[PDB]
Amino acid sequence: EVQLQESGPELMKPGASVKISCKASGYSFTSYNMHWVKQSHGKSLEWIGYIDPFNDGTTYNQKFKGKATLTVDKSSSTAYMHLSSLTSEDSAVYYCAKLGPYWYFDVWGAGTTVTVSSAKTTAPSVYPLAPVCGDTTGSSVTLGCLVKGYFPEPVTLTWNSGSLSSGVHTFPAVLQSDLYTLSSSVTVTSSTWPSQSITCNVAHPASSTKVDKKIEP
Amino acid sequence: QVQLQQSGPGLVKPSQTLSLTCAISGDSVSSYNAVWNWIRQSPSRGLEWLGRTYYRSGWYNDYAESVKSRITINPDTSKNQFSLQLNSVTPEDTAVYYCARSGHITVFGVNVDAFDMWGQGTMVTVSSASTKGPSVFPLAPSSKSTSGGTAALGCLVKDYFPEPVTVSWNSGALTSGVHTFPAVLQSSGLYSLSSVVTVPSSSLGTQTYICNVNHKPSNTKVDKKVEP
Amino acid sequence: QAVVTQESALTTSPGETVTLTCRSSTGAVTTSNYANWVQEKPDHLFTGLIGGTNNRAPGVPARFSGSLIGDKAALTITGAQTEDEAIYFCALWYSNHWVFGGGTKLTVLGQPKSSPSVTLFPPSSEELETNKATLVCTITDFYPGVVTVDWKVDGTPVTQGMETTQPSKQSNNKYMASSYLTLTARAWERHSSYSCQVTHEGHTVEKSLSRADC
Amino acid sequence: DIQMTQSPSSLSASVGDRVTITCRTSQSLSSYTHWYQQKPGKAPKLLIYAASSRGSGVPSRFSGSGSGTDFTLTISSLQPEDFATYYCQQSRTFGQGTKVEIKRTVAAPSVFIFPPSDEQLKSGTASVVCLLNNFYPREAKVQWKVDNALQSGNSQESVTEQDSKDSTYSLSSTLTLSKADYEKHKVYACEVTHQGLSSPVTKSFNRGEC
Ligand SMILES: OC[C@H]1O[C@H](O[C@H]2O[C@H](CO)[C@@H](O)[C@H](O)[C@H]2O)[C@H](O)[C@@H](O)[C@@H]1O
Ligand SMILES: OC[C@H]1O[C@H](O[C@H]2O[C@H](CO)[C@@H](O)[C@H](O)[C@H]2O)[C@H](O)[C@@H](O)[C@@H]1O
């Protein structure tokens, strides 16, 4: 059976173009053709079109005529999808998929995320999260670390330089005026804090800004 | 790494069986991506694929229609080879028989029927005549331009059956300006060819010239010194 | 532009038989639509299920079956299991092209009910220094993973400023989420009491915060 | 499995020339369409696979393309060593093949004659050989004269394939007589005519003097 490896995530400004690839490795005893599919918002699947690596036939969804171009390099076993004039509506995960003689999509690439944003690289501002000190009474306490106005994803957030691992919850980012904000919260015993040092270590590699921040009442 | 070594008699009597073998080096006969084909070449038919065998959780065989009814292609996992058997041959089966690998060349991981490695070919003659080994005579250089210029000398290989015969000079040492002519078929029904070379006249006194003649069908080997 | 319609979501218990449907906007689904189905699992793992209306792909369990039911194509799961929790898409063939449906999100209840822990934090000193303020409402340890969030300022409902992440999965297989109330530093000081409201399966957990306490 | 038509089925072209061979297939299956180069007494070598992918150790000057059911091999800059027969293929069917010949300047034959060996003559036959070496084009003709009389039989001729370096041809003619018949004559000659010669070249030997 063949395996399909798509190319890495891509970050583009409106008006740019992009070329995603999908490399087939392994073997197949029967011929097959390559379909490309778009997932929007994580649920809305859309057929873009297909190319046949064997007879060179292509068919497009009418919505994607002239936006998308499918090609193949038969010597490297690689399919390519080129998107012209990227818009916010092109922000999505793109999958390639094998359809062979039974006309079910039996192998899929893991997908390539394309993000279309005119936003600039901005580092995060990292804020402490501590309880209202009146509500100190309780056997466990939960702290946190707010990461606001970063771009682009990703950011990586740890606790006490990775030493503190359990009790931790890092939430998904929200999109707030073309920048992302995050948060991660920890639960430790009421005796551990404020007695011990609880410090979050936020990293934003895409601006080479790593930041530490310890928390007090 | 992949090599194909063909063997087995080139001369086959009418109505009898052609038997050829192709021994594989640098891959397995049962490899998941190896397809073992026989293909033949004649003037009548040009290049004609005859059939294959391949392993895929059990041996498969496909044959061309022209021969479906008298052809068998069999693998031997023991010796790592596969064989061709054609039954009840007629002169129409006189041809050069090649073995060939397919399925190494793939597009998007699938076998695309490109034949990437071929054996050397066995020349097959269907005839009831007997094998006869050549006589080898010298074509000696003349006294013309011995003092300075170019000498022509050669060997004549006459009255051999069947084809082919190979000729080399000085066991390969001399190849530049060698012409080995296509055999002709004499009215006797035996073949004859010449092999000739042009050499500096000044070498005639210092360098030896020997034509090495091989006729595999009769196990005839001859090395003939050609001299003034 | 043929449109393919599937029911949006469905929640079952293990052991139930479930039937998902796939309808063509242009008229009856027929054999010549050659309905196929794929399953999307977490981590964007697509695998194909059925082709040719009713032909299981290799390795697909026999509990899965394809059929035409009336004038729509259907996928029937006879004895759903927790591992069958996924999104199911059908695609229809329209002479020369495939059209995907919108997918049915299938939840199979495979763990105890769990009610949300709600922790509500105040805006920090440093963030206040920049004349901005964000209240963070962490929602953890709930199942199933469906929460409605709601905000109360001085006991009065909120309309804007609010963002809420989608339920995501925790180390312990329960669901978490977070909601934000982004205020300005003046609006923070103009009001006293603040409150995050989470609804889950019919009950409401809530937490309050008064500015006088910071 | 009726051999596919190739167009043309033969050509000759000068060194440096762009050359195009077209295969008439029955189906636009580019990836199962291949080309082979075959030099004389060699197995075909895979040249182009899947219409446009080049085989191992195939120079850049060879390229391939398709359009509908027509596939084309192009040799961008014809070289002397490109003398070959070229075959297309699709699935299990081969084309009829296309012979490519190099055009070059005219080059006249060098003529050599070889009397029979004493070794042969004891055996009862006499073979007399005339060699026409490294000429171009291929229309060289040989007449055998015995005591200045033209022979209308008793000879056989054979021509080499075009040389891979210098694009010339070579021919040998062999005149075969019984020993008895050989000795009833004195002067054996071959007379050679070819475009590169202003007038016929004759080489001859005297029986006995040899
Ligand atoms: O289409 C189903 C068959 O696919 C393969 O066979 C075809 O394609 C091969 C190369 O891709 C050819 O060698 C062969 O002649 C074709 O029949 C597969 O080998 C077969 O098992 C399938 O039935
Ligand atoms: O093939 C017929 C015969 O050819 C040769 O003999 C003829 O030609 C000779 C050369 O011109 C004459 O001298 C001779 O008298 C002819 O018979 C050959 O030597 C014969 O053995 C053949 O029968």
Three-state SS letters, D16-54 = CCCEEEEEECCCCCHHHEEEEEECCCCCCEEEEECCCEE
Residue D199 CB-half CA count within 13 A? 0
Which residues have C-beta within 8 Å of that of residue A128, sequence separation ≥ 6?
Answer: A143, A144, A145, A146, A213, A214, A215, A216, C124, C126
Determine if ligand 2 sits within 6 Å of the CB of residue D177.
yes
Total domains, chain B: 2
Residue at which a domain ends, from B128, B150, B165: B128
D160: CA distance to ligand 2 center in Å?
28
Chains D and A touch (3+ CB pairs under 8 A): yes
C200: CA distance to ligand 1 center in Å?
56
Could A74 and D28 be called an inter-chain contact, meaning their C-beta atoms sit closer than 8 Å?
no
**Range of the structural domain that residue B188 is part of:** 129-227
Map residue C161 onto helix, strand or coil: coil
Tokens coding D166: 């210098």
The dihedral region occupied by C130, where left means phi > 0, alpha psi between -120 and 50, and beta the remainder, is: alpha
Q: What is the DSSP string of C111-149?
A: S--BPPEEEEPPPPHHHHHTTEEEEEEEEEEEBSS--EE
Instruction: State which residue of chain D sits closest to B183, comparing Cα positions.
Output: D158
Both B2 and B89 in one domain: the answer is yes
Both B9 and B99 in one domain: the answer is yes
Chains B and C touch (3+ CB pairs under 8 A): no
Tokens coding D47: 């040249």
Which residues have C-beta within 8 Å of that of residue A217, sequence separation ≥ 6?
Answer: A130, A131, A133, A136, A194
Tokens coding D78: 């014809």
- The tokens 């609880």 sit on which residue? A198
Delimiting residues of CATH 2.60.40.10 domain(s) in chain A: 2-116, 125-214
Q: Chain A within 8 Å of B106 (Cβ-Cβ)?
A: yes
Could D29 and A55 be called an inter-chain contact, meaning their C-beta atoms sit closer than 8 Å?
yes
- The tokens 């977490």 sit on which residue? C42
Determine if ligand 2 sits within 6 Å of the CB of residue D181.
yes
The dihedral region occupied by D80, where left means phi > 0, alpha psi between -120 and 50, and beta the remainder, is: alpha
Cβ-nearest to A29 among B56, B107, B108: B56
Residue nearest ligand 2's atom 18 by CA: D177
Residue A165: count of CB within 10 angstroms of its CB: 11
Pairing of strands A10-12, A112-116: parallel
Pairing of strands B46-55, B95-102: unpaired
Which residues have C-beta within 8 Å of that of residue C125, sequence separation ≥ 6?
Answer: none
Nearest CA among B33, B179, B192, B209 for reference residue B106: B33
CA pair distance B173, B179, nearest whole angstrom: 15
Count chain A–chain C contacts defined by CB atoms under 8 A. Answer: 136
Nearest CA among A185, A183, A190 for reference residue A141: A190
Instruction: State which residue of chain A sits closest to B111, comparing Cα positions.
Output: A29
Q: What is the DSSP letter of C173?
A: S
Scanning B119-178 for CB atoms below 8 A from D yields 119-121, 135, 137-140, 142, 150, 152, 154, 156, 158
DSSP bridge partners of C66:
C75
Both B108 and B209 in one domain: the answer is no
Contacts of B108 in chain A (CB under 8 A): 2, 24, 28, 32, 34, 53-54, 72, 74, 77
How far does Cα D87 stand from its chain's mean position? 17
The answer to whether residues C195 and C151 touch, using CB atoms and an 8 Å cutoff, is yes
Residue type for position A124: P
Both B35 and B101 in one domain: the answer is yes
The dihedral region occupied by C96, where left means phi > 0, alpha psi between -120 and 50, and beta the remainder, is: alpha
Nearest CA among D62, D140, D156, D68 for reference residue D106: D140
Could D114 and B135 be called an inter-chain contact, meaning their C-beta atoms sit closer than 8 Å?
no
Tokens coding B64: 């061309």
Could D46 and B105 be called an inter-chain contact, meaning their C-beta atoms sit closer than 8 Å?
yes
Tokens coding B13: 């009597």
Could A30 and B107 be called an inter-chain contact, meaning their C-beta atoms sit closer than 8 Å?
no
A36: CA distance to ligand 1 center in Å?
25
- What b/e sequence results for A15-48 when a residue is b if at least 16 CB atoms lie within 10 Å of its CB, and e otherwise? eeebebbbbbeebbeebbbbbbbbbeeeeebbbb
Say which CATH architecture domain D1-103 belongs to.
Sandwich (2.60)
DSSP bridge partners of B161:
B132
B189: CA distance to ligand 2 center in Å?
18
CA pair distance C5, C135, nearest whole angstrom: 40
Nearest CA among C48, C75, C46, C45 for reference residue C59: C48
- Domain positions in chain C are 1-110, 111-210
Kindly give the residue spans of alpha helices, DSSP state H, lying in chain C.
125-129, 185-190
Residue nearest ligand 1's atom 15 by CA: D91
Map residue C82 onto helix, strand or coil: helix
Residue B143: count of CB within 10 angstroms of its CB: 10
Q: Which of B108, B111, B112, B115 to mutate to test the pocket of ligand 1 (most atoms within 8 A of CB)?
A: B111
D68: CA distance to ligand 1 center in Å?
22
Cα–Cα distances (Å) from B130 to B12, B48, C88, in that order, read 10, 28, 75
Residue at which a domain ends, from B109, B128, B147: B128
Residue type for position C7: E
Nearest CA among D63, D91, D73 for reference residue D4: D91
Residue D68 CB-half CA count within 13 A? 3
Tokens coding D175: 């005149």
The answer to whether residues B34 and B59 touch, using CB atoms and an 8 Å cutoff, is no
Tokens coding B150: 């170019």
- Domain positions in chain D are 1-103, 104-207
Residue type for position A189: T
Which residues have C-beta within 8 Å of that of residue B184, sequence separation ≥ 6?
Answer: B191, B192, B193, D156, D157, D158, D174
CA pair distance B187, A150, nearest whole angstrom: 95
Could A54 and D28 be called an inter-chain contact, meaning their C-beta atoms sit closer than 8 Å?
no
Determine if ligand 2 sits within 6 Å of the CB of residue D183.
no
Technique that determined the structure: X-ray
User: In chain D, where do the E strands start and end?
Assistant: 5-7, 10-14, 19-24, 33-38, 45-49, 53-54, 62-67, 70-75, 84-90, 93-94, 98-103, 110-114, 125-135, 141-146, 149-150, 155-159, 169-178, 187-193, 201-206
Map residue C154 onto helix, strand or coil: coil
Using only C-alpha atoms, chain B has a radius of gyration, in whole angstroms, of 22
The CATH code of domain A125-214 reads 2.60.40.10
CA pair distance D163, D166, nearest whole angstrom: 6
Q: What is the DSSP string of A78-144?
A: EEEEEE-S--GGG-EEEEEEEE-TT-SEEEE---EEEEE-----BPPEEEEE---GGGG-SSEEEEE
Which residues have C-beta within 8 Å of that of residue A188, sequence separation ≥ 6?
Answer: A140, A141, A143, A164, A167, A196, A198
Nearest CA among A120, A151, A142, A150 for reference residue A186: A142
Domain D104-207 belongs in CATH node 2.60.40.10: yes
The residue among A28, A30, A51, A55 with the most chain D CBs within 10 A of its CB, best to mutate, is A55
Residue B226 CB-half CA count within 13 A? 31
Both B66 and B4 in one domain: the answer is yes
Say which CATH architecture domain C111-210 belongs to.
Sandwich (2.60)
Pairing of strands D70-75, D62-67: antiparallel
Residue nearest ligand 1's atom 2 by CA: A30
CA pair distance B114, D47, nearest whole angstrom: 10
Which residues have C-beta within 8 Å of that of residue C195, sequence separation ≥ 6?
Answer: C120, C151, C152, C153, C155, C206, C207, C208, C209
Ligand 2 atom closest to D177 (CA) = 19
The answer to whether residues A10 and A112 touch, using CB atoms and an 8 Å cutoff, is yes
Q: What is the CATH number of the domain that holds B173?
A: 2.60.40.10
The answer to whether residues A85 and A67 touch, using CB atoms and an 8 Å cutoff, is yes
Which residues have C-beta within 8 Å of that of residue B10, sequence separation ≥ 6?
Answer: B122, B123, B124, B125, B162, B163, B164, B216, B217
The CATH code of domain A2-116 reads 2.60.40.10
- What b/e sequence results for D119-154 when a residue is b if at least 16 CB atoms lie within 10 Å of its CB, and e otherwise? ebbeeebbbbbbbbbbbbbeebebbbbbeeeeeeee
Nearest CA among A105, A62, A64, A56 for reference residue A81: A64
Residue at which a domain ends, from B128, B153, B184: B128
CATH class of C1-110: mainly beta
CA pair distance C126, A15, nearest whole angstrom: 38
